[PDB]
Write an enzyme that holds these catalytic residues in place. Structure first.
Site, mmCIF file in Angstrom:
data_model
loop_
_atom_site.group_PDB
_atom_site.id
_atom_site.type_symbol
_atom_site.label_atom_id
_atom_site.label_comp_id
_atom_site.label_asym_id
_atom_site.label_seq_id
_atom_site.Cartn_x
_atom_site.Cartn_y
_atom_site.Cartn_z
ATOM 1 C CE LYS A 1 -24.952 3.492 22.424
ATOM 2 N NZ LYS A 1 -25.321 3.639 21.008
ATOM 3 C CB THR A 2 -31.066 1.320 24.944
ATOM 4 O OG1 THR A 2 -30.440 2.598 24.868
ATOM 5 C CG2 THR A 2 -32.223 1.441 25.939
ATOM 6 N N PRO B 1 -31.812 -12.425 21.434
ATOM 7 C CG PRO B 1 -33.406 -13.997 22.179
ATOM 8 C CD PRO B 1 -32.334 -13.064 22.669
ATOM 9 C CG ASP C 1 -29.553 -12.287 17.457
ATOM 10 O OD1 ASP C 1 -28.346 -12.033 17.327
ATOM 11 O OD2 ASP C 1 -29.891 -13.419 17.851
ATOM 12 C CB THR D 1 -26.397 5.647 17.007
ATOM 13 O OG1 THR D 1 -27.512 5.946 17.844
ATOM 14 C CG2 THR D 1 -26.818 5.964 15.571
ATOM 15 C CD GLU D 2 -32.082 2.736 14.333
ATOM 16 O OE1 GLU D 2 -31.733 3.824 13.744
ATOM 17 O OE2 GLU D 2 -33.085 2.052 13.899
ATOM 18 C CG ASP E 1 -31.242 5.413 24.759
ATOM 19 O OD1 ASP E 1 -32.262 5.150 24.106
ATOM 20 O OD2 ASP E 1 -30.085 5.430 24.268
ATOM 21 C CD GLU F 1 -27.512 3.314 26.103
ATOM 22 O OE1 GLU F 1 -28.468 3.061 26.874
ATOM 23 O OE2 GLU F 1 -27.661 3.483 24.859
ATOM 24 N N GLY G 1 -24.360 7.109 20.852
ATOM 25 C CA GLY G 1 -23.719 6.872 19.549
ATOM 26 C C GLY G 1 -22.666 5.779 19.720
ATOM 27 C CE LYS H 1 -28.053 7.801 26.072
ATOM 28 N NZ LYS H 1 -27.631 6.878 24.967
ATOM 29 C CB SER I 1 -29.067 14.321 21.821
ATOM 30 O OG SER I 1 -28.572 13.360 20.915
HETATM 31 N N1 LIG Z 1 -32.739 -7.656 20.012
HETATM 32 C C1 LIG Z 1 -33.720 -6.821 19.672
HETATM 33 N N2 LIG Z 1 -34.764 -7.296 18.958
HETATM 34 C C2 LIG Z 1 -35.500 -6.488 18.197
HETATM 35 N N3 LIG Z 1 -35.376 -5.158 18.148
HETATM 36 C C3 LIG Z 1 -34.276 -4.649 18.751
HETATM 37 C C4 LIG Z 1 -33.471 -5.454 19.548
HETATM 38 N N4 LIG Z 1 -32.462 -4.681 19.928
HETATM 39 C C5 LIG Z 1 -32.725 -3.433 19.563
HETATM 40 N N5 LIG Z 1 -33.977 -3.369 19.099
HETATM 41 C C6 LIG Z 1 -34.608 -2.117 18.497
HETATM 42 O O1 LIG Z 1 -33.653 -1.451 17.584
HETATM 43 C C7 LIG Z 1 -33.610 -0.050 17.903
HETATM 44 C C8 LIG Z 1 -32.239 0.283 18.485
HETATM 45 O O2 LIG Z 1 -32.018 -0.392 19.772
HETATM 46 P P1 LIG Z 1 -31.346 0.484 21.046
HETATM 47 O O3 LIG Z 1 -31.122 -0.479 22.152
HETATM 48 O O4 LIG Z 1 -32.160 1.712 21.348
HETATM 49 O O5 LIG Z 1 -29.939 0.958 20.207
HETATM 50 P P2 LIG Z 1 -28.820 2.114 20.583
HETATM 51 O O6 LIG Z 1 -29.151 2.239 22.125
HETATM 52 O O7 LIG Z 1 -27.506 1.575 20.204
HETATM 53 O O8 LIG Z 1 -29.242 3.401 20.014
HETATM 54 C C9 LIG Z 1 -34.750 0.191 18.895
HETATM 55 O O9 LIG Z 1 -35.998 0.514 18.229
HETATM 56 C C10 LIG Z 1 -34.884 -1.140 19.649
HETATM 57 O O10 LIG Z 1 -36.220 -1.261 20.228
HETATM 58 C C1 LIG Z 2 -26.816 10.755 20.688
HETATM 59 C C2 LIG Z 2 -27.751 10.887 19.453
HETATM 60 N N1 LIG Z 2 -29.138 10.622 19.742
HETATM 61 C C3 LIG Z 2 -29.375 9.327 19.472
HETATM 62 O O1 LIG Z 2 -30.320 8.678 19.940
HETATM 63 N N2 LIG Z 2 -28.418 8.864 18.611
HETATM 64 C C4 LIG Z 2 -27.551 9.951 18.199
HETATM 65 C C5 LIG Z 2 -26.045 9.529 18.024
HETATM 66 C C6 LIG Z 2 -25.190 10.675 17.451
HETATM 67 C C7 LIG Z 2 -23.801 10.373 16.922
HETATM 68 C C8 LIG Z 2 -22.953 11.625 16.902
HETATM 69 C C9 LIG Z 2 -21.552 11.303 16.324
HETATM 70 C C10 LIG Z 2 -21.529 10.498 14.951
HETATM 71 O O2 LIG Z 2 -22.204 10.907 13.979
HETATM 72 O O3 LIG Z 2 -20.896 9.435 14.943
HETATM 73 MG MG LIG Z 3 -29.086 3.714 23.471
HETATM 74 MG MG LIG Z 4 -30.550 4.778 20.246
#
Ligand SMILES: Nc1ncnc2c1ncn2[C@@H]1O[C@H](COP(=O)(O)OP(=O)(O)O)[C@@H](O)[C@H]1O
Ligand SMILES: C[C@@H]1NC(=O)N[C@@H]1CCCCCC(=O)O
Ligand SMILES: [Mg+2]
Ligand SMILES: [Mg+2]
Ligand SMILES: Nc1ncnc2c1ncn2[C@@H]1O[C@H](COP(=O)(O)OP(=O)(O)O)[C@@H](O)[C@H]1O
Ligand SMILES: C[C@@H]1NC(=O)N[C@@H]1CCCCCC(=O)O
Ligand SMILES: [Mg+2]
Ligand SMILES: [Mg+2]
Lengths: 224, 224
Positions: B15-16, B204, B176, B11-12, B54, B115, B118, B37, B41
């Site tokens: 993906k989004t 980027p 990145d 996660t983070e 997301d 999407e 996690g 999506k 959560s």
């Molecule tokens: N390439 C990018 N440049 C800078 N910040 C990024 C970039 N990609 C992701 N972000 C930031 O990092 C965090 C996670 O990105 P997100 O796409 O929401 O990840 P996930 O969907 O895997 O949870 C968010 O705050 C997003 O705005």
């Molecule tokens: C979906 C949840 N909300 C969110 O933005 N990230 C969390 C990801 C949870 C991961 C749950 C399984 C693990 O810990 O790997």
């Molecule tokens: Mg996401």
């Molecule tokens: Mg996220």
């Protein structure tokens, strides 16, 4: 003599802190212990050459007095993937050398813990990973799971790949990398159900110098 | 009509942000797009009910005007694993409902991006993971790799498990997540060699609101 390879769901999840707990528990059980960190990157300069902090922790937590090079034959200054810094420095990482070091430790220790670097698949060269070496040595594997969001997925991924390589997942250690959060008990329950190995113990959140804390008590070596 | 499932090394990791780039590129190619999506959560209260960020990003990056519930049927307030909050709230996550929503989007879109939540193995119930649903639907998978230390291992783990489930790893996107670091080119080379799918592009580091940035240009949809 017993040998275990300790891997983690990622780098910075507690492989070293958990490895020290495991070693302390084994000493408590009466074993002649040794920790082995064959490959290490992210090291400081000293009068004797580069020294890595994980290797030093393993060395000080061993029951035997071990020379640094015996604990860690391959030491790189920059904390990047081993294959990158090995290639840039022209210092190849050899399976034979890593295996010879493990044998050398078995000369005096009857319980040897080998810490990996990074996660399961850390590359050692462009064609050889840490997973390749663990597979060659057929070491039973201990998985360190940093209890945090995202750890269920990483724990499941690592466990599946380990089992698919034909290796034994001997157990897992729950490491509290952060202070207690809201879904702590539910995460522990989920990890316990999903990881196909015994939970050996849970190391609490220890803010100050966890590597030297008395954490052997958190491990039940009889489940190993 | 084309369908892709977007997963990430954790996660983070982007993906989004990457999903928005993919959708923007598909709109540029002339497709009638929709983002989906199914499970989310970590959502905020509004007059219309809970809304997840997301899902809102996917909704605003779709070429079609889509109702929120069509983009995200299952919305939970607490940002914890879906199975935990689903069980605590007594709101079961059903495969049939997730699949029906995907079909509903296919009524009007000819290019659908789904999407996940996690990483690969996020649990939806105590006996069913997100990976189970992707496998049932036989969706080709796009892997988003956050370029950072630890991503080679996570990318390799995720790719191996995807391939072992019999699924197609359609491509990967390099994101990145941090400003340029020292081993950027070496990491890109290593990921490129190791991931058995085409690199679709590299997004980027975009500090401010990357989700609404024009990032479609970073994706080469002809490699998809
Ligand atoms: N390439 C990018 N440049 C800078 N910040 C990024 C970039 N990609 C992701 N972000 C930031 O990092 C965090 C996670 O990105 P997100 O796409 O929401 O990840 P996930 O969907 O895997 O949870 C968010 O705050 C997003 O705005
Ligand atoms: C979906 C949840 N909300 C969110 O933005 N990230 C969390 C990801 C949870 C991961 C749950 C399984 C693990 O810990 O790997
Ligand atoms: Mg996401
Ligand atoms: Mg996220
Ligand atoms: N249970 C613990 N309590 C508090 N801090 C922790 C604990 N476990 C790990 N640490 C700290 O988190 C960081 C990573 O732990 P370490 O064992 O070095 O991880 P890895 O060996 O996987 O790289 C270190 O700074 C360590 O001191
Ligand atoms: C060994 C390195 N030094 C360190 O203390 N952690 C780094 C881990 C590197 C991971 C390399 C592969 C990957 O990115 O997953
Ligand atoms: Mg470390
Ligand atoms: Mg370590």
């Amino acid at each position: 003599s017993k040998r275990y390879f300790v891997t983690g769901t990622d780098t910075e999840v507690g492989k070293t802190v958990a490895s020290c707990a495991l070693l302390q528990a084994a000493k408590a059980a009466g074993y002649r212990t040794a920790g082995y960190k064959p490959v290490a990157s992210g090291s400081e300069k000293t009068p004797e050459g580069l020294r890595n902090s994980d290797a030093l922790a393993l060395q000080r937590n061993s029951s035997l007095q071990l020379d640094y090079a015996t604990v860690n034959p391959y030491t790189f200054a920059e904390p990047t993937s081993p294959h990158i810094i090995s290639a840039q420095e022209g210092r190849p990482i050899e399976s034979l050398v890593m295996s010879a070091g493990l044998r050398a430790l078995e000369q005096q220790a009857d319980w040897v813990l080998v810490e990996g670097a990074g996660g399961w698949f850390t590359p050692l060269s462009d064609t050889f990973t840490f997973a390749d070496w663990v597979t060659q040595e057929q070491l039973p594997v201990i998985l360190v799971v940093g209890v945090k969001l995202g750890c269920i997925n990483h724990a499941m991924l690592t466990a599946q790949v380990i089992q698919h390589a034909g290796l034994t997942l001997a157990g897992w250690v729950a490491n509290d990398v952060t202070p207690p959060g809201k879904r702590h008990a539910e995460y522990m329950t989920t990890l316990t159900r999903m990881i196909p190995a015994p939970l050996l113990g849970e190391i609490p959140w220890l803010a100050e110098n966890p590597e030297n804390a008395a954490t052997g008590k958190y491990i039940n070596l009889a489940l190993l």
